Amino acid sequence: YEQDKTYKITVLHTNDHHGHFWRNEYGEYGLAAQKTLVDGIRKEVAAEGGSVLLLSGGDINTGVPESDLQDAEPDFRGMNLVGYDAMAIGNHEFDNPLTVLRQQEKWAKFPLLSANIYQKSTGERLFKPWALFKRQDLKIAVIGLTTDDTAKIGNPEYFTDIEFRKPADEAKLVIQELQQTEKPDIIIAATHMGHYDNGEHGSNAPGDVEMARALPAGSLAMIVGGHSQDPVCMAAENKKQVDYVPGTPCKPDQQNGIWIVQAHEWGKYVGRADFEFRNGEMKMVNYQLIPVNLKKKRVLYTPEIAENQQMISLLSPFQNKGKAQLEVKIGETNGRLEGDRDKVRFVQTNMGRLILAAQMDRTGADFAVMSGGGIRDSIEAGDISYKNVLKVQPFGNVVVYADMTGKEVIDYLTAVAQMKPDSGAYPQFANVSFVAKDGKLNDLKIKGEPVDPAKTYRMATLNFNATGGDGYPRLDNKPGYVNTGFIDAEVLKAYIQKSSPLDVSVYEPKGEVSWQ
Ligand SMILES: Nc1ncnc2c1ncn2[C@@H]1O[C@H](COP(=O)(O)OP(=O)(O)OP(=O)(O)O)[C@@H](O)[C@H]1O
Ligand SMILES: [Zn+2]
Ligand SMILES: [Zn+2]
């Protein structure tokens, strides 16, 4: 670089897009508005003589039917038009077979990076560990890292001959590889690891904070993160704001001289970190999260951002094709799946069993529960479409699971069994049997076996219930909890599709649970 020259560099970032290429029902987010905003920032920076780098923390896949049904093609093509420079591979990039991820790499004009994903049989990285960018005469390296919980959580599929090594350790190796070969002026890490207050990752794999602390001080200008899906705006040292409000100041985290940022999820914000580089020193001069048409129970927090027409023309066919696909038969059933309010809030039903079977299958759970009030429609005997599934599960809840001890299972089920019939809180159970008497659960069994307080059990449910919905005991603040990011409707639809034709007699309750 030129000695004593001051380079202005703006790093824009997003993460955990999860199929949100289109604006939502209230006109929020979407890539068309994102495109207008990013184009505008590039124009602003170009006029000031600076440079722009746009990075993604990953998890482009999974979360919106129109995207999922098309393997996120609209999302990657839209990202090409917004002009992303690089993205870290997220755990949801492995929700589809490797053939699909390789197709996404072909669609994407920017590198999908990860230094710590290895082919087991050869010990060789599967993807590129970093990408180099020339901005002015500076060399900026962006390394990519992926959480090593990827193949560990839920019910793994698609990791043939693949392993995820510890990302913090890999970062150490990569930074050294880079300094010894490329000597980049600036190194930024795009990661899909998660931000945990004060590095308190609990049962989850260590994330960004612990990594920043393990690396040499200031060895990275910043970590552009994701996975945990939070706007990283600090309220106090080592404490993220709770209920961060769009349009308000956002102080990113700084750990061991390394800035750590995250822009929540779904294209809700484009983070903007403005830096000044001079003689080796990377100094952050400003940071903000720029909302993309976010609205407060329907009014804009910041100036409306128009939707770029080129993006609308590019994405519309995908939106239309995805919507039309919702009508297509995904399966069939030989009997009515009972989801009516006056049944699901009074007794166990086959729709409850089917939904819970789908959730257990996705998460590797041993048993499951959900509120009957969460079942919103029945499905008549005959053909089933995704549209039908979305009426049964319309709230967009996320499937989650908790690993708990047998004693915790006893306490949890005992508490949930207190929710009375004729209320939305009445529980639908799967793989649970007992006779409730005087507030106690007698002969409690999981999968036909008495509960062993010394054993570990995995329970699936929805985030709504796990966070205390309907007065259920909270599980989200306990170790062993995992929010999978899979939407209830997608889990049910995919399970019906691979299980069809469904013989509903398999889901008929036979008095496993009773109250008296
Ligand atoms: N966003 C949501 N996610 C999951 N479940 C939900 C959600 N919103 C509502 N429910 C479920 O619906 C129940 C409330 O039902 P509903 O909205 O039909 O009630 P209501 O018409 O106000 O009447 P009541 O108050 O008698 O239930 C809750 O107890 C809960 O189980
Ligand atoms: Zn995610
Ligand atoms: Zn993730």
Per DSSP, the residues of 448-496 read TEE--TTSEEEEEEEHHHHTTGGGPPP-TTSTTEEEEEEEHHHHHHHHH
Name all domains of the chain by residue range, CATH numbers in brackets: 1-328 (3.60.21.10), 329-515 (3.90.780.10)
Paired residues of 164 in beta bridges:
117
DSSP H or E stretch at residue 390: helix 386-392
For ligand 1, say whether the CB of 424 is within 6 Å of any of its atoms. Answer: yes
What does the alpha-carbon distance between residue 335 and residue 302 come to, in Å, rounded to a whole number? 50
What does the alpha-carbon distance between residue 90 and residue 262 come to, in Å, rounded to a whole number? 14
Length of the chain: 516
Which of 340, 344, 395, 420 is the best mutation target for the ligand 1 pocket, counting ligand atoms within 8 Å of the beta carbon and taking the most?
395
Q: Which of 492, 495, 503 is nearest to 388 (CA)?
A: 492
- Whether the link from the prior residue into 65 is cis, omega within 30° of 0, is no
Exactly one of 16, 185, 208, 366 is catalytic; which is it?
A: 16
CA angle 293, 296, 300 (to 5 degrees): 35
Spatial contact of 426 and 374, defined as CB atoms under 8 Å apart: no
Q: Which of 469, 2, 8 is nearest to 283 (CA)?
A: 8
Alpha-carbon separation of residue 212 from 29, 170, 201, 216, 224 (angstroms) = 30, 12, 13, 8, 12
Residue indicated by tokens 């993160």: 225
Beta strands, E only, 377-468: 382-385, 398-405, 427-430, 432-437, 440-446, 449-450, 456-462
Residue indicated by tokens 């089933």: 384
- Please give the annotated binding residues, written as ranges: 16, 18, 59, 91, 192, 227, 229, 341-345, 464-470
DSSP H or E stretch at residue 335: none
98: three-class secondary structure by DSSP: helix
Q: Which two tokens stand for residue 455?
A: 């054993």
Query: What spacing in Å lies between the alpha carbon of 229 and ligand 2's midpoint?
Result: 6
Query: What spacing in Å lies between the alpha carbon of 424 and ligand 1's midpoint?
Result: 6
Residue located nearest, by CA, to atom 2 of ligand 1? 395
What does the alpha-carbon distance between residue 59 and residue 18 come to, in Å, rounded to a whole number? 6
Query: What spacing in Å lies between the alpha carbon of 88 and ligand 2's midpoint?
Result: 12
- The answer to whether 348 is a known catalytic residue is no
Query: What spacing in Å lies between the alpha carbon of 485 and ligand 2's midpoint?
Result: 6
Q: Which of 408, 400, 331 is nearest to 370 (CA)?
A: 400
221: three-class secondary structure by DSSP: coil
Query: What spacing in Å lies between the alpha carbon of 192 and ligand 3's midpoint?
Result: 6
Q: Which of 271, 266, 270, 279 is nearest to 252 (CA)?
A: 271
Query: What spacing in Å lies between the alpha carbon of 339 and ligand 1's midpoint?
Result: 14
DSSP H or E stretch at residue 501: none
The torsion angles phi and psi of 428, rounded to 5 degrees, stand at -105, 130
- Give the number of whichever ligand sits closest to the CA of residue 60: 2
Kindly give the interhelix angle for 98-107 and 73-82, rounded to the nearest 10 degrees: 30
- The answer to whether 59 is a known catalytic residue is yes
Residue located nearest, by CA, to atom 4 of ligand 1? 374
DSSP state of 510: -
DSSP H or E stretch at residue 36: helix 31-48
Q: Which of 372, 341, 370, 390 is nearest to 462 (CA)?
A: 370
Exactly one of 18, 77, 264, 272 is catalytic; which is it?
A: 18
13: three-class secondary structure by DSSP: strand
Q: 228-249: b or e for each residue (b if 16 or more CB lie within 10 Å)? A: bbbbbbbeeeeebbeebebeee
- Please give the annotated binding residues for substrate, written as ranges: 341-345, 464-470
What does the alpha-carbon distance between residue 428 and residue 43 come to, in Å, rounded to a whole number? 55
- The answer to whether 341 is a known catalytic residue is yes
Spatial contact of 190 and 111, defined as CB atoms under 8 Å apart: no
Which of 359, 392, 464 is the best mutation target for the ligand 1 pocket, counting ligand atoms within 8 Å of the beta carbon and taking the most?
464
421: three-class secondary structure by DSSP: coil
Q: Which two tokens stand for residue 438?
A: 């005087």
- Please give the annotated binding residues for Zn(2+), written as ranges: 16, 18, 59, 91, 192, 227, 229
For ligand 1, say whether the CB of 374 is within 6 Å of any of its atoms. Answer: yes
- Give the number of whichever ligand sits closest to the CA of residue 376: 1
Query: What spacing in Å lies between the alpha carbon of 325 and ligand 1's midpoint?
Result: 29
Q: Which two tokens stand for residue 283?
A: 């100094």
Angular region, 118: left φ>0, alpha ψ -120 to 50, beta rest: beta
Q: How was this structure determined?
A: X-ray
For ligand 1, say whether the CB of 397 is within 6 Å of any of its atoms. Answer: yes
Q: Which two tokens stand for residue 300?
A: 């804009």
Spatial contact of 216 and 224, defined as CB atoms under 8 Å apart: no
- The answer to whether 95 is a known catalytic residue is yes
DSSP output for 246-269 = TTS----EEETTEEEE-B-STTSE
What does the alpha-carbon distance between residue 440 and residue 405 come to, in Å, rounded to a whole number? 18
Pairing of strands 239-240, 253-255: unpaired
Spatial contact of 167 and 147, defined as CB atoms under 8 Å apart: yes
Kindly give the interhelix angle for 309-325 and 31-48, rounded to the nearest 10 degrees: 160
Spatial contact of 145 and 163, defined as CB atoms under 8 Å apart: no
Exactly one of 42, 125, 278, 376 is catalytic; which is it?
A: 376
Q: Which of 131, 25, 124, 31 is nearest to 74 (CA)?
A: 31
Sequence-distant (≥ 6) Cβ neighbours of residue 82 within 8 angstroms: 31, 34, 35, 38, 54, 311
- The answer to whether 24 is a known catalytic residue is no
Query: What spacing in Å lies between the alpha carbon of 354 and ligand 3's midpoint?
Result: 26
Spatial contact of 74 and 318, defined as CB atoms under 8 Å apart: yes
For ligand 1, say whether the CB of 395 is within 6 Å of any of its atoms. Answer: yes
Residue located nearest, by CA, to atom 19 of ligand 1? 424
What does the alpha-carbon distance between residue 193 and residue 184 come to, in Å, rounded to a whole number? 23
Exactly one of 195, 345, 353, 458 is catalytic; which is it?
A: 345
Q: Is 435 exposed, middle or buried (0-12, 13-18, 19+ CB in 10 A)?
A: middle
Residue indicated by tokens 């390296």: 141
Q: Which of 477, 398, 444 is nearest to 62 (CA)?
A: 398
The torsion angles phi and psi of 253, rounded to 5 degrees, stand at -80, 150
Spatial contact of 427 and 462, defined as CB atoms under 8 Å apart: no
- Give the number of whichever ligand sits closest to the CA of residue 425: 1
Residue located nearest, by CA, to atom 29 of ligand 1? 424
- The answer to whether 345 is a known catalytic residue is yes
Alpha-carbon dihedral 229, 233, 235, 239, rounded to 10 degrees = 40
Spatial contact of 305 and 49, defined as CB atoms under 8 Å apart: no
- The answer to whether 165 is a known catalytic residue is no
Q: Which atom of ligand 1 is nearest to the CA of 372?
A: 31
What does the alpha-carbon distance between residue 369 and residue 372 come to, in Å, rounded to a whole number? 9
User: In angstroms, what is the resolution?
Assistant: 1.7
The CB density around residue 25, as the number of other CB atoms within 10 Å, is 6
Q: Give me the half-sphere count of Cα atoms (radius 13 Å) on the Cβ side of residue 267.
A: 31
Spatial contact of 15 and 262, defined as CB atoms under 8 Å apart: yes
303: three-class secondary structure by DSSP: coil
Residue type for position 156: P
